[PDB]
Design a protein around this ligand. Structure first.
Ligand SMILES: Nc1ncnc2c1ncn2[C@@H]1O[C@H](COP(=O)(O)OP(=O)(O)O)[C@@H](O)[C@H]1O
Ligand SMILES: Nc1ncnc2c1ncn2[C@@H]1O[C@H](COP(=O)(O)OP(=O)(O)O)[C@@H](O)[C@H]1O
Ligand SMILES: Nc1ncnc2c1ncn2[C@@H]1O[C@H](COP(=O)(O)OP(=O)(O)O)[C@@H](O)[C@H]1O
Ligand SMILES: Nc1ncnc2c1ncn2[C@@H]1O[C@H](COP(=O)(O)OP(=O)(O)O)[C@@H](O)[C@H]1O
Ligand SMILES: [Mg+2]
Ligand SMILES: [Mg+2]
Ligand SMILES: [Mg+2]
Ligand SMILES: [Mg+2]
Lengths: 681, 371, 370, 371
């Protein structure tokens, strides 16, 4: 109304992530006022738009460090508060006890020995929000409580998730004493793990495809003893199939563009577009990354972590054998009214056997046949082409998956010091998690279903923590919380994993059922979950998509593509080929398997089964520690220092699950006052 | 926990765990008892021997089969083989694992009820189920449509299935298998001067059959060839050092599967029974059933049986259909493989027979819940 | 634009107004399983519609929801309409006006329940019911002419002159293609061929469609058949069995002209057409003699037109000119004419809207249509 | 020159003379042949046993019916049966006696032509005629208006006749009769352990069905009482001394006529077939077709088949109509009793087919002389 009042103007547009934008009233004259929004754009209101303009609370005009104190507790209130603080280089903001971090794309001088000392021994709220303040109260809490702690950093690919973990080590090494080698050793394992576990997606050129757990070990007097790196949830389907505009793990491309010709001769390697595994997304070269100095960065980091040159050569041979096996081409035959195969002649088969150090006839009769061993006899059975292109792709993912464990163990052989407290277990730890976030792309597939399934467990972990803390805020004030409803997102979990005839098992069942396809699986899913409020069946019988109502919203997955990624068929002949190999390295990574040589009759777990096992391990590790949550937000799609995209940020706020915190606050007593406030009224 | 699969046939017991590739335990379904005088005091005394231990100490025992032609005739001795399978071969407690059993289609109704009652009262299984073997032979073959010929050791049944639907009126059940074949071989081996009589020598004759018997493409030309020359004769060494020679007896014994009148039966051969079962189904099913003849069972392991089956069915069928005989190399374990596949399915977990249901209804719940 | 659903007794012809040919043409059948499902895990449906029901023909019992033009099983009719709307046309029924076709003389409840179901189950913005024999003239591009529509449920004649129809000259017959299929089934059990099941009737229908013709002279053709085997054709059954038929190729397309074979006391199509023309004004008859339109798939028998001309030339005066118009696409004439009618600007004021249905009930159709 | 009436059906052959009150040569229609080996040299050995002598030596012969579902398949065994009937049973030379034969209403046209050729060339009868069994049943019942439900062991046909006028378009022919009724009891008898496979044991199953099978008024209430007590159980003794026991197959076997889905058939029951046949006639004829239901054939001899039929037709018919089922106590021979009446008429002697007419026309004169 008045020519100097802030208002909540709502420019109604056809946008899915549109929220009211703050604006200041200026040049109030005639019948039509003028406003300038937070983006410095001018608009005319007209007398016929009076409901659009709504007064803005005085708390929302000056900004507040803790958003739970906002007068206007909504998505618009959160978005503007972040926006007006990002322009002031304030990239850290609280929502209760959750640190929202926004990628600055800029070197901000807020990480100094004077800042780490300024933030020592001070609780949340005493100091302005910072990444150290999360670590500050995380360190002090385990000493007073004798309990393990954990930090969960999550967001999209590129919102400083790995940087926030590096910077949470900068304080933590200094607060105890010398930075020590462990601070420098942990930072050398990042370029190694970001080669075997990162890849280029359609949203970022360096996307983490697993969950990294840096478990930091402490001792009495509070000093660093060691550290463990635990990898969880690796997308092993990427090794053999990539989507359009996406590429395989960085290691393959880096090795090829950074290896000498002589060496590349011994490995029978050439270019990188001559490999089906590497070239499938048509993204051999990615802008912003050069794969020649990236190779040198990995090699230098490997030397520091005590990788001998012999160990580097054996790793490259395994990687080369992965690329050669992907070039093998199968042709369907008919033995006698039975499906059969015949691997077409190619120089890759000769090289792959040489690099694997097995007899060429023993590898030929290990991808086209299967041996059934029973009491008293053994029988050989041919494999169909669809079955032949499932053992080759499972042996490739079996080498890469077991290799990735080998690098992790070799790194842990230099930074993890066994408990010197052999006498008694008196060690507390601080865990850090670099986990991915909810993703809703244009076309979703098997990998996105697993990624979103993992976040359902993580978002339930968040909700149960937010529920608890708000209950103790009520009882120090003696406020009885028995009229407030505390619902958990078990319905989504009880449809995907935690119930008979769930979504995952029906995907597993159709992978083994006779004459099973993606269309048959879709009918199976509909026939069981059509009367469920969280399942959206396709409208016609020609559509090949189904929808699941997650916490973030409804996401549609494409049926065409499943049952091929969800197959990891390691037969008993594969574990017997490795055991007979002259290569002592491939037998070292298969050490556990070759021990139980005759116990592989049990069918190999599928990738959905292996993913669920790791998720159970992760939820058990996190459930034993008090959690701290960090929310990472990227403000731009062009990596600009001072560009804040509103529609980009609103999507990440909804997908982070942080908006749940507001919902309970509205459900309870949203407005809290002190007795001094009673002066008014 | 993990479910057990027990394909207790007339001749062999194939047992294991659901979700595996092959049966862990494959042992004969025999119970042996001493028939002589034990003279040495202090020797370990055992009133009964079950499985391979009865085949090892076989010259001092009497061997008996508790199952004949698919029907369990001696329940006290069959209860010993189940105990042996559960505790000695699989080494597992039966009260913590669901058990899947198999049975032939046209089998008396009380056999299945007594299996249910024994499972729920003697072994105290939490759940169980009884399935048709020919249905599991399609699960093992990876098909949802086909006519299956399952010839084991007691019976030979054909079951036509189309798109997961079985036509129960076209199911046929012949009582002629590898034990009638063994008896016929015992009888016709007496023409060359070899007399095999005892229950311990019947197992020698069975091994002779399994190692030297095949199926002739043309019986009347193979007989003439055997009469003319000695190229068909083979030798076999008895467990004492004696060698026996057999000529046309190598293909005269499997021939009774195609000419059941050799043992005095009036029924038709396995080639004509399959055609009669196909021609009893709907006309729109026959083209897809001709090209999907799945052969299962250990009796279908003779060399040349698939070729002769294809020849005979091609002669019986119109000269426009594509007659295909599917005989996988592992067809001796296809019933067990299909049973494991069925027991590993998530949809099947709602189709067990729980002990609450058995305690409420009785042993008659199996007729209402199984097939 | 708009939906045109020519919904006959045997086939469903659906598409969009303004097109030249129907988009979806599938059998009007609903099949249900009749055997026992033994394989656990197989996706099981309780009903199949159309080409999916005619593909799994062996294990299903086929049932036509429409007999002789009247819809008898409204649940299966609703299933067929849902299949047509969602799976074949992939449209939203609540966003397209629908044009339906019906035989001239049918019970009023058949037309009322179509309106009530189309407005209360599919929520169409508007709907209409037209006469199948009028759309055939639209397809033929004519204004004057008598239409002999013959599907597989009914056979009716509607004389039309200069856009005006004479309701007193409308004659409806209940002898059509599904009676021909059953007569062929009955008379095929004279050579040893037994076809009893509902799935063995779709085979006899195909035998009829591929091997039956209309004899120009029935008594001169029955003699030729006995004289020589030159009129005798083979047909291989779905299981590889070859069956050979003789005079039954033209004895089945004879109950159209001699309905006494099936046991009905009625005149042939030629006599019915002659009576329908002679029940009009004396001046109009000359224009209907030369414009006898034929529509339907029972008018697709080789030789049917020639015999119609021969039979109507022997009953009409010798000074008149009899011309039988048989378009090469008479199997789709009703749908083509329906699309032409629904694409007209003048017709847009004749739709039965949802508001009028709410105001007046399902009885608005009897005062808005025909 | 007395006329001969031969009601040669699928299972039983009825013969005699035109004018008599009952058939004199009722014997089965099987032709057995030796199966085993003959060892005793000097014994009088026959290569074929026809009629009652094939049931005495039933343990060493393979029995085969030359007629199935009305159609004649073996035209040599048919000649043997006719020779036996004319010489060993009637003791009449076929040269000097006109003959009358019966046939199903909707049989293939080649069957009647072949019978005409055989009777006019092999036996050289002076006159011949082929009639429809329903008309002869009406003649025996002494009525001119009514629908007959004839059911033997081959076919089950309905023919509506009003005032001596038949409606060909309402004639229904269903190939479900005693044979499948026997072959289904022989299959559901395996649920209690009894296994009859031999063609000679099928003749024992037929005797069990003819002696212990009835039709239940309400199948559900009958099963609820057969599963709650043992008051419905009956015993029977086999030709070897063993005693069988049947508890619910007695009323489960005959129901496949009112519910053909038991044996895998898609057709409707006899009650629905009769209702549909009556509802395909003129609106005036239905009133006196409802009250003139004549049941013929040996399959209509089950205790309780005349009450369930009436109940079903009453339920399917309007409540103001009078439904009456006429089941004479001698309907097992009504076809022959009416054939004798037809052949003893003075107005029928001009309807015979003479040898001169056959010679001057051919085997195709039956299609115009008969029916
Ligand atoms: N606090 C920060 N200060 C400066 N730059 C940062 C900060 N956080 C992230 N970045 C920049 O963002 C880029 C990507 O961050 P990273 O953590 O690797 O992404 P992700 O979260 O996908 O692992 C890095 O190159 C880094 O320079
Ligand atoms: N190689 C072989 N050739 C021929 N017959 C065999 C062979 N191996 C096993 N058999 C026969 O298979 C029968 C048992 O097979 P199986 O199907 O396992 O028995 P069951 O069905 O009773 O479990 C034995 O009677 C044996 O004679
Ligand atoms: N080529 C043909 N010859 C003879 N009859 C045919 C032919 N094609 C189709 N028919 C018959 O036409 C009938 C249906 O014709 P149509 O009028 O197109 O469908 P509807 O009657 O359902 O509108 C079918 O019963 C079929 O027997
Ligand atoms: N008392 C009875 N109860 C049940 N069925 C009977 C009885 N008597 C005869 N039948 C059946 O009638 C059938 C033959 O009857 P019939 O009409 O004489 O045969 P056909 O049709 O060959 O003349 C036999 O198959 C027999 O099963
Ligand atoms: Mg990262
Ligand atoms: Mg077996
Ligand atoms: Mg039509
Ligand atoms: Mg009779």
């Amino acid at each position: 109304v008045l020519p100097g009042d802030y208002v909540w103007m709502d420019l109604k547009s056809g946008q899915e992530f549109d929220v009211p934008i703050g604006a200041v009233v200026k040049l109030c004259d005639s019948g039509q006022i003028q406003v300038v929004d937070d983006e410095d754009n001018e608009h005319w209101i007209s007398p016929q738009n009076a409901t659009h303009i709504k007064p803005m609370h005085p708390t929302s005009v000056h900004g507040v460090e803790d958003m739970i104190r906002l007068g206007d507790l909504n998505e618009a209130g959160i978005l503007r508060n972040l926006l007006i603080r990002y322009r002031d280089h304030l990239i850290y903001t609280y929502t209760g006890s959750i640190l929202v971090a926004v990628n600055p794309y800029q070197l901000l001088s807020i990480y100094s020995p004077e800042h780490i000392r300024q933030y020592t021994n001070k609780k949340i709220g005493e100091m302005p929000p910072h990444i150290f303040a999360i670590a500050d109260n995380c360190y002090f809490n385990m000493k007073r409580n004798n309990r393990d702690q954990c930090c969960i950093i999550s967001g999209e690919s590129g919102a400083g998730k790995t940087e926030s973990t590096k910077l949470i080590l900068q304080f933590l090494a200094a607060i105890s004493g010398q930075h020590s080698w462990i601070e420098q050793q942990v930072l050398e394992a990042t370029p190694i793990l970001e080669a075997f576990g990162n890849a280029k997606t359609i949203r970022n050129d360096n996307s983490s495809r697993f969950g990294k757990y840096i478990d930091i070990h402490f001792n009495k007097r509070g000093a660093i003893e060691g550290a463990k790196i635990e990898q969880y949830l690796l997308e092993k389907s990427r090794v053999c199939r990539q989507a359009p505009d996406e590429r395989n793990y960085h290691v393959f491309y880096c090795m090829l563009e950074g290896m000498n010709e002589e060496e590349k001769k011994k490995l029978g390697l050439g270019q990188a577009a001559d490999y089906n595994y590497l070239a499938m997304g048509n993204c051999i070269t990615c802008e912003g990354r050069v794969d020649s100095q990236e190779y040198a960065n990995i090699r230098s980091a490997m030397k520091v972590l005590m990788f001998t040159d012999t160990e580097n050569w054996e790793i490259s041979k395994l990687l080369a054998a992965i690329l050669h096996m992907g070039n093998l081409q199968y042709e369907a035959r008919t033995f006698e009214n039975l499906d059969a195969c015949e691997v077409l002649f190619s120089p890759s088969l000769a090289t792959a056997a040489s690099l694997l150090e097995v007899n060429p006839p023993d590898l030929m009769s290990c991808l086209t046949s299967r041996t059934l061993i029973t009491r008293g006899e053994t029988v050989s059975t041919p494999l169909s082409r669809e079955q032949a292109l499932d053992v080759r792709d499972a042996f490739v993912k079996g080498i890469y998956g077991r290799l990735f464990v080998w690098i992790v163990e070799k790194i842990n052989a230099a930074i993890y010091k066994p408990p010197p407290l052999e006498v008694k277990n008196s060690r507390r730890s601080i865990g850090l998690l670099d986990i991915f976030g909810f993703e809703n792309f244009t076309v979703n597939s098997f990998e996105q279903l697993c990624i979103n399934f993992a976040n359902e467990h993580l978002q339930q972990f968040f909700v149960r923590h937010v529920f608890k803390l708000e209950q103790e805020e009520y009882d120090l004030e003696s406020i009885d919380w028995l009229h407030i409803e505390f619902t958990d997102n078990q319905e989504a979990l009880d449809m995907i994993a935690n119930r008979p005839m769930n979504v995952i098992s029906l995907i597993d069942e159709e992978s083994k059922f006779p004459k099973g396809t993606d269309a048959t699986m879709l009918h199976k899913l509909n026939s069981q979950h059509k009367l469920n409020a969280n399942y959206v069946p396709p409208k016609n019988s020609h559509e090949t998509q189904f929808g699941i109502n997650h916490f973030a919203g409804v996401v549609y997955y494409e049926s065409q593509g499943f049952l091929e990624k969800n197959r990891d068929t390691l037969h008993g002949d594969i574990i017997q080929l490795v055991h007979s190999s002259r290569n002592k390295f491939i037998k070292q990574i298969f050490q556990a398997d070759v021990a139980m040589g005759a116990e592989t009759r049990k069918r190999s777990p599928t990738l959905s089964s292996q993913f669920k096992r790791s998720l159970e391990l992760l939820m058990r590790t996190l459930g034993a520690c008090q959690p701290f949550f960090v929310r990472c937000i990227k403000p731009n799609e062009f990596k600009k220092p001072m560009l804040f995209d509103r529609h980009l940020c609103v999507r990440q706020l909804r997908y982070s699950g942080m908006m749940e915190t507001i919902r309970i606050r509205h459900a309870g007593y949203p407005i809290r006052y002190s007795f001094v406030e009673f002066v008014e009224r | 926990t993990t479910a057990l699969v027990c394909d207790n046939g007339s001749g062999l017991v194939k047992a294991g765990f659901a979700g595996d590739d092959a049966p862990r335990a494959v042992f004969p379904s025999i119970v042996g008892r001493p028939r002589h005088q034990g003279v040495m005091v202090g020797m370990g005394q055992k009133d009964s021997y079950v499985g391979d231990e009865a085949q090892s100490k076989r010259g001092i025992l009497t061997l008996k089969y508790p199952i004949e032609h698919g029907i369990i005739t001696n329940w006290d001795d069959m209860e010993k083989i189940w105990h042996h399978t559960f505790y000695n071969e699989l080494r597992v407690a039966p009260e913590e694992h669901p058990t899947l059993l198999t049975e032939a289609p046209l089998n008396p109704k009380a056999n299945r009820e007594k299996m249910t009652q024994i499972m729920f009262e003697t072994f105290n299984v939490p759940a169980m189920y009884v399935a048709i073997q020919a249905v599991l032979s399609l699960y093992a073959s990876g098909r949802t449509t086909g006519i299956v010929l399952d010839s084991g050791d007691g019976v030979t049944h054909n079951v036509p299935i189309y798109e997961g639907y079985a036509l129960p009126h076209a199911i046929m059940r012949l009582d002629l298998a590898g034990r009638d074949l063994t008896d016929y071989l015992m009888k016709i081996l007496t023409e060359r001067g070899y007399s095999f009589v005892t229950t311990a020598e019947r197992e020698i004759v069975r091994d002779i059959k399994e190692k030297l018997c095949y199926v002739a493409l043309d019986f009347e030309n193979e007989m003439a060839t055997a009469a003319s020359s000695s190229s068909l004769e083979k030798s076999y060494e008895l467990p004492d050092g004696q060698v026996i020679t057999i000529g046309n007896e190598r293909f005269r014994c499997p021939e009774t599967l195609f000419q059941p009148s050799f043992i005095g039966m009036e029924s038709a051969g396995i080639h004509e029974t399959t055609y009669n079962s196909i021609m009893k189904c709907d006309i729109d099913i026959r083209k897809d059933l001709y090209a999907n003849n799945v052969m299962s069972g250990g009796t279908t392991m003779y060399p040349g049986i698939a070729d002769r089956m294809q020849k005979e069915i091609t002669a019986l069928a119109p000269s426009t259909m594509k007659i295909k005989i599917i005989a996988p190399p592992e067809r001796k374990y296809s019933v067990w493989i299909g049973g494991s596949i069925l027991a590993s399915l998530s949809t099947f977990q709602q189709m067990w027979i729980t002990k609450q249901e058995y305690d409420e209804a009785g042993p008659s719940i199996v007729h209402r819940k199984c097939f």
